[PDB]
């Protein structure tokens, strides 16, 4: 699992040569489609996606294809002739409370991050700016702001959602997740 998921886990950030990921993202299409959190990219003048390879980190410019503001998601497209290993959208699954999940990300240096945890709720609200997002998952697999925008997966490596790190009233990092089904239904006008 920790061998076959990371290639589809990317870093997302601005276009500066000396800039690193400020969030994570999930490759969901062979021609370079990436799902990430909307608030992470919406104010970036230019978007660069950082991809792990056997030769080290490669960067690709990306454009926003579609915003999903009501769920704080963005669909990006990398501008490249290259093909990518990716999450299969047909393999997307739901999870239930108590089920073990794994939250993947990439840090500011391009290194992979993974944490496992349990689903703790399957219906939780979250406010992102002025948007009230509903029917999110909660899990303790999300421990770092750097995991935001990265994928939640089940033990089989199926994409189950996109993570959002939120702050509690006390500063404790709390883990939220947009269910992957939201991607499918809000993107039935692209690929
Ligand atoms: Cl929406
Ligand atoms: Ni919706």
Residue numbers in the entry: 34 to 224
What does the paper say about this structure?
Although the MamO crystals grow in acidic conditions that disfavor metal binding, they could be soaked at pH 8.0 without affecting diffraction. We solved another structure of the protease domain using crystals soaked in NiCl2 at pH 8.0 and identified a metal binding site. Overall, the conformation of the protease domain is highly similar to the original structure (root-mean-square deviation of 0.17 Å over 184 residues), and it contains the unidentified peptide. Additionally, a single Ni2+ ion binds between loop LC and helix 2, with H148 and H263 directly coordinating the metal. We confirmed the placement of the ligand at this site using single wavelength anomalous dispersion (SAD) data collected at the Ni absorption edge. MamO’s di-histidine motif is highly reminiscent of the Zn2+ binding site in another trypsin-like protease, kallikrein-3, in which Zn2+attenuates protease activity by altering the position of catalytic triad residues H57 and D102. Taken together, our biochemical and structural investigations show that MamO binds to transition metal ions using H148 and H263, but that metal binding is not restricted to this motif.
Two genes in the MAI, mamE and mamO, are homologous to the HtrA proteases, a ubiquitous family of trypsin-like enzymes that functions using His-Asp-Ser catalytic triads.
